[PDB]
Enzyme design. Structure first.
Site, short mmCIF file in Angstrom:
data_model
loop_
_atom_site.label_atom_id
_atom_site.label_comp_id
_atom_site.label_asym_id
_atom_site.label_seq_id
_atom_site.Cartn_x
_atom_site.Cartn_y
_atom_site.Cartn_z
N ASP A 168 -10.25 -32.76 12.99
CA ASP A 168 -10.17 -33.04 11.70
C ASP A 168 -8.70 -33.15 11.01
OD1 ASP A 168 -10.76 -33.07 8.97
OD2 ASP A 168 -12.79 -31.94 9.31
N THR A 169 -8.49 -34.47 10.69
CA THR A 169 -6.97 -34.66 10.20
C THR A 169 -7.01 -34.28 8.59
OG1 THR A 169 -5.78 -36.36 11.56
CG2 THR A 169 -6.71 -37.05 9.45
N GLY A 170 -8.24 -34.21 7.91
CA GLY A 170 -8.28 -33.79 6.71
C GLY A 170 -8.31 -32.16 6.51
#
Ligand SMILES: *[C]C(*)(*)(*)(*)([C]*)C(*)(*)(*)(C(*)(*)(*)(=O(*)*)N(*)(*)(*)C(*)(*)(*)(*)([C](*)[C@]1(*)=C(*)(*)(*)C(*)=[C@](*)(*)C(*)(*)(*)(*)(*)(*)=C1(*)(*)*)C(*)(*)(O*)C(*)(*)(*)C(*)(*)(*)([C](*)C1(*)(*)(*)=C(*)(*)(*)(*)(*)(*)C(*)=C(*)[C@@](*)(*)=C1*)C1(*)(*)(*)=N(*)(*)(*)C(*)=C(*)(*)(C(*)(*)(*)(=O(*)*)C(*)(*)(*)(*)([C])[C]*)[N@]1(*)*)N(*)(*)(*)(*)C(*)(*)(O[C]C1=[C][C]=[C][C]=[C]1)=O*
EC number: 3.4.23.16
Lengths: 99, 99
Positions: A25-27
Site C-alpha cells: 500500500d503506497t497510500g
C-alpha cells in the site's frame, strides 16, 4: 517484479516465524498488520486513515521478509482488516511506482 | 514518470475544471476525493478504510487528468482526509508497482 494493478497487489510476508499475505500500500505511511503473536515491548500509538482512528501496538526493529525480500522496521499491530505494507518498508525493498 | 516512495506519492489532477494534488494509492480499490464542487447525479455508496466507514456519493463517467493523462471513471466524493487515486483509475493510466 513488475506488479500490475487490476488486482489488489497482494504479496506474501513472513513475520515472527509465520506466514500472512499483505497488501502493498503506497497510500500508507505506515505498515499495519492485523493482530498477531509478536515478541517484546511495544508502545501505544494511534494512527489515522479513512473512516477514523484506531489504537495500535507500535513494534520497532522487526524483521519482515516481504515477497522473499528481508527488511527491518516499525510494524504496528492492531484492528486493521488487511495486513498493509506501507512506504516505511517499500523503500527498503526498493519498490517504485511507475507509469 | 517513476516515483520512489521516500515521501508520499502526491500528483496533480484536474477534475471538473479545478486543480488538486492526489495520492496514487495501490491499497485503494476506488478513488475518493474530498467534498468537492462536482456535478451530475450521484448515488449514496459506503466504504471501509482502517478507521471504519464513511458514506460517499458516487459519480460515474467522470473525466480526470492525472499527470496530463486523462482517464474516466467512478469517483467517490466525501469526507476523506486526503484525495486518493484508487486502482480503478491507476490501471487506466498504466500504473505498476515495481521492485
Ligand atoms: C497507515 C494507514 C493507517 C494509512 C491509511 O489508512 N491509508 C489509506 C489512504 C489514506 C486515508 C486517509 C489519509 C491518507 C491516506 C489507504 O492507503 C488504506 C487502505 C487500507 C485498506 C486496504 C484494503 C482494504 C481495507 C483497507 C484503504 N483505505 C480505504 C481503502 C479503500 O480501498 C476504500 C476506497 C474502499 N483502502 N494512513 C496514513 O496516514 C494518515 C495521515 C497522516 C497525516 C496526514 C494525513 C493522513 O498513511
Amino acid at each position: 517484479p513488475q506488479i500490475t494493478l487490476w488486482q489488489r497487489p497482494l504479496v506474501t510476508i513472513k513475520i515472527g516465524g509465520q506466514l500472512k499475505e499483505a497488501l502493498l500500500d503506497t497510500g500508507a505511511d505506515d505498515t499495519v498488520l492485523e493482530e498477531m503473536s509478536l515478541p517484546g515491548r511495544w508502545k501505544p500509538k494511534m494512527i489515522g486513515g479513512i473512516g477514523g482512528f484506531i489504537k495500535v501496538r507500535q513494534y520497532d526493529q522487526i524483521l519482515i521478509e516481504i515477497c522473499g525480500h528481508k527488511a527491518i522496521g516499525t510494524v504496528l499491530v492492531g484492528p486493521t482488516p488487511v495486513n498493509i505494507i506501507g512506504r516505511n518498508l517499500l523503500t527498503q525493498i526498493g519498490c517504485t511506482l511507475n507509469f
